[PDB]
Amino acid sequence: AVVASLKPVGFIASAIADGVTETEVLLPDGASEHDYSLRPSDVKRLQNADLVVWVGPEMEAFMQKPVSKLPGAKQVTIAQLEDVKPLLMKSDFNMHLWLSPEIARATAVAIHGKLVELMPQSRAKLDANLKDFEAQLASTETQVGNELAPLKGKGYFVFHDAYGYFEKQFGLTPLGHFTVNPEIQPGAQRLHEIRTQLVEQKATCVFAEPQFRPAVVESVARGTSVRMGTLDPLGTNIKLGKTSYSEFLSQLANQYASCLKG
Ligand SMILES: [Zn+2]
Numbered sequence: 215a216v217v218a219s220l221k222p223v224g225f226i227a228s229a230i231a232d233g234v235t236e237t238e239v240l241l242p243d244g245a246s247e248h249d250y251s252l253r254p255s256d257v258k259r260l261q262n263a264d265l266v267v268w269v270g271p272e273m274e275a276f277m278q279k280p281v282s283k284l285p286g287a288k289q290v291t292i293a294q295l296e297d298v299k300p301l302l303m304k305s306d307f308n309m310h311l312w313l314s315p316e317i318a319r320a321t322a323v324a325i326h327g328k329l330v331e332l333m334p335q336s337r338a339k340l341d342a343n344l345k346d347f348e349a350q351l352a353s354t355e356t357q358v359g360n361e362l363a364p365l366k367g368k369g370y371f372v373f374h375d376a377y378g379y380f381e382k383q384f385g386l387t388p389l390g391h392f393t394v395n396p397e398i399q400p401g402a403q404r405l406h407e408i409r410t411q412l413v414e415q416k417a418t419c420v421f422a423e424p425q426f427r428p429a430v431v432e433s434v435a436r437g438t439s440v441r442m443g444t445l446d447p448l449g450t451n452i453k454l455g456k457t458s459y460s461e462f463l464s465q466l467a468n469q470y471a472s473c474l475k476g
Contacts, residue, residue, distance in 0.1 A: 216325070217259050219268035219277060220247055221448050222312040223292070223321070225459035227267050229347040230325045232456045234336040235264055240277070243450045246425045248374075248397050250276050260284075265328050267321070269293050273309040287331060290324045292317065297324070303378060313447065313466070314379035315355055318459060322347050346456070354460040358467040359384055365474040369417035371408060373431055376423075376447040380466065389417055392434075396426050409434045419473040421445045443473025 215236040218224035224239035231237050240256050241247065252260070260266060260280045270293035271278045281289055292298055292311050297320035302308070311317045326344045330337050362384040369389040374396040381388055389411060392400050400408075412420065412434070420435050421443045422428035428442075435442050446469065449462040 215259070215263060216265045216267060216329075217263035219266075219274045220312060221450065221452070221454075222459065222462055223267050223269070224454050225449060225452065225462050226312070226318050226321050226347075227265075227325055228454040229350075229456055229459055230322050230329065230340065230343050232339075232343050234329060234333060234339055234343070237454050238263075239454070241274075241448070243448075244425060246396060247273065247448070248395055250274075252276055252280070263288060264332055265290065265325070267292070267325060269309055269311050272307070273311075287328065290321065290328060292321050292324075295320055295324050303382065305375075308375075308378045310376045310379060310447065313377060315351055315383060315463070317379065318351065319348065343456075347459070350457060350460045354463050355383075358463055361467045361471055362386060365471060368419070368474050369412075369415050370419035370421065370474065371412065371417065371434075372421045372445060373423045373426060377445065380463075384467075386470065389415055392431065396423070400430065405430065405434055409438065412440050413438055418476075419443050421469075421473065423447065424450055441473050443469060445469050 215238045216227045216231045217238045218227045220241050221239050224237050228237040238259055241250055257280060265288050266281055266284055267290040268274050268277060268281060270291045293309060298317050301317050322344060326340050329340050366385040367387055371389055372391045374393045375391040417440055419441050420431050422431045424446050452458050452461050
């Protein structure tokens with residue numbers, strides 16, 4: 215199998231590996247990229263992988279050691295790809311790379327190249343999968359761009375700073391985030407200051423995330439006219455599959471729009 219660290223990385227892998235080999239995801243549904251320790255069975259899946267795909271040591275540090283044990287031919291370290299380095303955006307760089315369509319393309323290309331070498335019998339299928347992935351992703355970018363266009367200029371806060379690549383591509387205008395690392399409590403001072411900004415800068419939304427209890431986000435919204443939504447940067451409800459990555463970007467767009475639209 216192809217073993218991906220995070221579900222949306224699994225979505226990209228599953229576009230390319232469809233009808234070639236299975237895709238497995240290490241980080242379980244409901245867990246955060248910022249808070250994991252590999253279970254004994256996760257370590258086994260990784261050791262037995264045909265190919266491992268992950269962002270890199272500045273993101274999923276919990277897996278740097280076992281990944282380093284694998285042959286180079288059996289890993290894709292997205293953040294270290296020559297195609298990806300020029301696309302990295304400064305936060306020290308933002309490592310939430312799976313929300314960048316262009317980085318997703320570079321990732322798909324790298325997965326394709328690795329699997330063509332490992333599984334030469336599947337060359338035609340891999341080629342067709344990559345072609346299909348790119349066609350679908352282009353369609354999705356057009357659709358998501360259109361959906362988000364009327365929402366540009368509307369202010370909002372996100373729970374943690376995960377969305378920068380996606381927001382930059384589609385022209386969304388967040389005012390800020392409650393947290394950088396969602397494992398760190400923002401503190402009461404920060405919270406009343408966020409409310410002040412939401413009110414003074416006439417923000418539309420605040421967003422919770424399914425991986426974290428929303429009480430803190432709800433507490434800031436209270437007293438104000440700000441609407442509450444939810445963004446899921448890990449696409450928890452979406453199943454792996456050929457069109458899963460496009461489904462994920464479309465779902466994220468819908469989550470923004472559900473709250474931000476008037
Ligand atoms: Zn994150």
